[PDB]
Amino acid sequence: LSWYKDDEEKEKKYMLSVDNLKLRDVEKGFMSSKHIFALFNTEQRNVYKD
């Protein structure tokens, strides 16, 4: 999984994996509208750069 600042596909600072990951939601009190869910991993330390 990658994240770019534009559509030209030239950011490529870091490419985040997909397999061996977990999923949680944000803490209570936060406004999901704009639904934000957090990625982390309990098996590995691959978050990445939490």
CSV table of C-alpha atoms in Angstrom, one decimal:
chain,number,residue,atom,x,y,z
A,1,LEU,CA,0.0,0.0,0.0
A,2,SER,CA,1.4,3.4,-0.9
A,3,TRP,CA,0.5,7.0,-0.3
A,4,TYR,CA,1.3,9.9,-2.7
A,5,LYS,CA,0.9,13.6,-2.5
A,6,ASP,CA,-0.4,13.8,-6.0
A,7,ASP,CA,-1.6,11.5,-8.9
A,8,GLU,CA,1.7,11.3,-10.8
A,9,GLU,CA,2.9,8.2,-8.8
A,10,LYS,CA,6.3,9.8,-7.8
A,11,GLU,CA,6.1,10.3,-4.0
A,12,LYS,CA,7.3,6.7,-3.0
A,13,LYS,CA,8.8,7.7,0.3
A,14,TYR,CA,7.6,4.6,2.0
A,15,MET,CA,5.4,1.7,0.9
A,16,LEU,CA,3.3,0.1,3.6
A,17,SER,CA,2.6,-3.6,3.6
A,18,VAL,CA,-0.9,-5.1,3.8
A,19,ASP,CA,-0.4,-8.7,5.0
A,20,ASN,CA,0.3,-9.4,8.7
A,21,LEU,CA,-1.4,-6.3,10.1
A,22,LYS,CA,-4.3,-5.5,12.4
A,23,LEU,CA,-7.1,-2.9,12.5
A,24,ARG,CA,-8.6,-0.7,15.2
A,25,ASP,CA,-10.7,2.4,15.2
A,26,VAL,CA,-9.8,5.8,16.7
A,27,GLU,CA,-10.3,6.6,20.4
A,28,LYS,CA,-13.6,7.7,21.8
A,29,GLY,CA,-14.6,11.4,21.6
A,30,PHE,CA,-13.1,11.8,18.1
A,31,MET,CA,-15.3,12.8,15.2
A,32,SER,CA,-15.5,10.1,12.4
A,33,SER,CA,-17.2,11.7,9.4
A,34,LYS,CA,-14.5,11.2,7.6
A,35,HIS,CA,-14.3,7.8,9.3
A,36,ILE,CA,-10.7,7.3,10.5
A,37,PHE,CA,-9.4,3.8,11.4
A,38,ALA,CA,-5.9,3.1,12.7
A,39,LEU,CA,-3.6,0.4,11.4
A,40,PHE,CA,-1.0,-1.2,13.6
A,41,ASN,CA,0.3,-4.8,14.2
A,42,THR,CA,0.4,-6.9,17.3
A,43,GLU,CA,2.4,-9.7,15.6
A,44,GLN,CA,5.0,-7.4,14.1
A,45,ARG,CA,6.2,-3.8,14.6
A,46,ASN,CA,5.2,-2.9,11.1
A,47,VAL,CA,2.8,0.0,11.6
A,48,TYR,CA,4.8,1.8,10.0
A,49,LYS,CA,6.4,4.9,11.7
A,50,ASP,CA,3.5,5.2,14.2
